[PDB]
Write a protein that binds this ligand. Structure first.
Ligand SMILES: NC(=O)c1ccc[n+]([C@@H]2O[C@H](COP(=O)([O-])OP(=O)(O)OC[C@H]3O[C@@H](n4cnc5c(N)ncnc54)[C@H](OP(=O)(O)O)[C@@H]3O)[C@@H](O)[C@H]2O)c1
Ligand SMILES: NC(=O)c1ccc[n+]([C@@H]2O[C@H](COP(=O)([O-])OP(=O)(O)OC[C@H]3O[C@@H](n4cnc5c(N)ncnc54)[C@H](OP(=O)(O)O)[C@@H]3O)[C@@H](O)[C@H]2O)c1
Ligand code: NA
Ligand code: NA
Lengths: 370, 370
């Protein structure tokens, strides 16, 4: 199978390339690498010689592929995909971008949750497979066990989203902001006798100052938060908040009887893990031990963290999870509202299960089943 | 009125002293300053000469006061308060500490919400007035308008709590952690061609390394979060999470018909503002304009931020709120679960309304009404 890689050089793409090298995915395919800025120079060598970088916008080049895996983004998909399909291309389009998620001809791919749906699509002629929004995917990797048993009546999701979700430059800005904060008070920090109110005054001044690097975020992220992600929608939701409901219900095949999913999506000063605090209304009073088992046994990556203080602090954090495929979920307990209310807190890496991982896994499923 | 100040030198105390200087509170009282480490040296001059620092543990000194305002902490109150009352002291005890909050002889003081309760207490012989938990106070300052009309059926609160809540040393640690993160990748940050994955790898390594300053938190806060605050309780709540329900219902005088309040309390890398994402179940379908008006008109400090993207990013953040008495609340909208579900996101300064402000205000109310 001849497979085109688009957007391989960027952040999501680079994570994908690393994982494909680790799992030796290139042994299984004839890779063809594409570019927008380096067309015609030698392609990267990830174990296999793929020749030259091809033109990402050249429909005649793309047409010759059996599949495309693209991490290039929505603008690219909007330009290229319709032209490709119109040209009669029947190849597999595997996409990180949100563009085609809600298209009737596309399946949102998160195989530990919806493998059967993916297999059914492959059998019955589906050629477009799209990764879900990072938040949706990470939530379902954590709570798949509850959703598959149809136990969720509704869910409120308050998120703690890392800078990586906004982009590589936003991550860089976060770290730079951290540096500027510390620089402003490094002297008083080194002095044990210094006043916390003096330190605080300078930190606040610095974060507000013109010189504080805010070109990407518009406002500080380090030392703060931003309770709005993506464009506004008519009902008052941000696009990020809206994605959860429509995408999860499509993945789960519940579009005829959708689970209400809503909440506030908040950007915090984490590097590359998204965390979520969930109020989960269940249809039945189910004992906590049974809930924990249902959750734990759903997939190989979810990890139930015992509701104890010290283990939570060590395990249920971005610092622990970053750069790993582990999806810990903890603080599992019934809430004051009733024994059909379940509290959960989960953390997952935004670039792995939230981006790159479903793409490479979908490739392997297609290879086995086509 | 002869008023003792205990814990005036610490973080909360220092904020209190600043506010008392700003509002010229010392004109109204004969201040007597106490100490544990500098007994017998000249007291601070905040406009008035108060003589020498007295022994904070000397019951014979405390007995001579008409009132005590203490920011010293729970350990101090546990040691001193029972002995003071047993000695027949009938003075006013105004306390930042959690110790006496749930005692039947004490009123939790948050006058923009419960002035009438405070006045009734003063009239009928209450001598102990205690500030509520920072999270509870800040939530009620935002949502007082809804709670006073008895419209809240239940509320789920997912918090974003600043380092200041844990203490001055924890704030210092947060900033130091930020510095260490930036130091590790400052070179690659200055290089536009550097790889985000290389930067990420080093940041992750650094946060995990032994040398990362974590003596106070135990784990990283900068670049991460900690979804556990304070000791575990039997039902699986942390003490911080438990405080919300019992304290809010006492403030509101609803102990006979309590509103269920629960959620997860999370420490994030903010300096001194606590933020909260709330799922509020209302008893009635009330139009959003009416909800906004009810909220906005409750008190002088709550600020309804329009549910628009750019204004939210500028106004509804720790960076905006820090060091001010403003309590913005935004993202006000009906949720997917139904028109009796209300989403709200609020930010408030932890040291002002969450600590120092109710103490000085209670002093003034007592002076007027006694
Ligand atoms: N302005 C922005 O912040 C912006 C821009 C792009 C994407 N995005 C978002 O990010 C998602 C795409 O994932 P991503 O974050 O992985 O995209 P990304 O990092 O921006 O990479 C996408 C493409 O940009 C090119 N690129 C430009 N400068 C680069 C650099 N310094 N290092 C590596 N590649 C560079 C590369 O294509 P070539 O090899 O052909 O040069 C790469 O394949 C999209 O869904 C989109 O929403 C935002
Ligand atoms: N180990 C801890 O992290 C610890 C310690 C204390 C309080 N707390 C918590 O914090 C709350 C009290 O508020 P807070 O945070 O304002 O307390 P704080 O900053 O620790 O100040 C409380 C007292 O500690 C003394 N102190 C010791 N070192 C100091 C320093 N370097 N600068 C100024 N004062 C110093 C002061 O008393 P003197 O003037 O008599 O020396 C001060 O009044 C309590 O509710 C408690 O839970 C925690
Ligand atoms: Na700036
Ligand atoms: Na350490």
């Amino acid at each position: 199978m001849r497979v085109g890689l688009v957007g391989w050089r960027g952040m999501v793409g680079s994570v994908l390339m690393q994982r494909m090298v680790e799992e030796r995915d290139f042994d299984l395919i004839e890779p063809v690498f594409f570019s927008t800025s380096q067309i015609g120079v030698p392609a990267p060598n990830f174990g296999k010689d793929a020749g030259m970088l091809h033109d990402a916008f050249d429909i005649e080049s793309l047409k010759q592929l059996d599949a495309v895996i693209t991490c290039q983004g929505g603008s690219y998909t909007e330009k290229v995909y319709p032209a490709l399909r119109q040209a009669g291309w029947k190849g597999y389009w595997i996409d990180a971008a949100s563009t085609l998620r809600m298209d009737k001809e596309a399946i949102i791919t998160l195989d530990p949750v919806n493998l059967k749906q993916i297999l059914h699509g492959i059998h019955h002629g589906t050629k477009t497979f799209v990764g879900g929004n990072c938040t949706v995917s990470l939530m379902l990797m954590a709570l798949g066990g509850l959703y598959e048993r149809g136990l969720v009546e509704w869910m409120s999701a308050m998120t703690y989203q890392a800078a990586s979700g906004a982009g590589a430059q936003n991550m860089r800005e976060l770290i730079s902001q951290m540096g500027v904060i510390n620089d402003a008070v490094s002297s008083e920090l080194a002095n044990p006798a210094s006043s916390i109110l003096d330190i605080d005054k300078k930190v606040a001044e610095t974060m507000r100052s013109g010189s504080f690097p805010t070109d990407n975020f518009g406002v500080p992220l380090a030392g703060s938060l931003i309770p709005w992600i993506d464009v506004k929608r008519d009902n008052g939701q941000s696009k990020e908040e809206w994605k959860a409901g429509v995408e999860a219900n499509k993945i789960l095949g519940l579009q005829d009887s959708p689970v209400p999913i809503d909440g506030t999506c908040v950007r915090i000063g984490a590097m590359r893990c998204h965390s979520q605090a969930l109020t989960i209304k269940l249809k039945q009073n189910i004992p906590l031990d049974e809930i924990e088992e249902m959750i734990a046994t759903h997939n190989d990556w979810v990890k139930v963290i015992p509701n104890e203080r010290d283990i939570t602090a060590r395990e249920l954090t971005p610092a622990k999870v970053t750069g790993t495929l582990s999806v810990p979920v903890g603080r599992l307990r019934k809430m004051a509202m009733g024994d059909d209310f379940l509290n959960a807190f989960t953390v997952g890496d935004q670039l792995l299960w939230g981006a790159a991982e479903p793409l490479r896994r979908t490739l392997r499923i297609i290879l086995a089943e086509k």
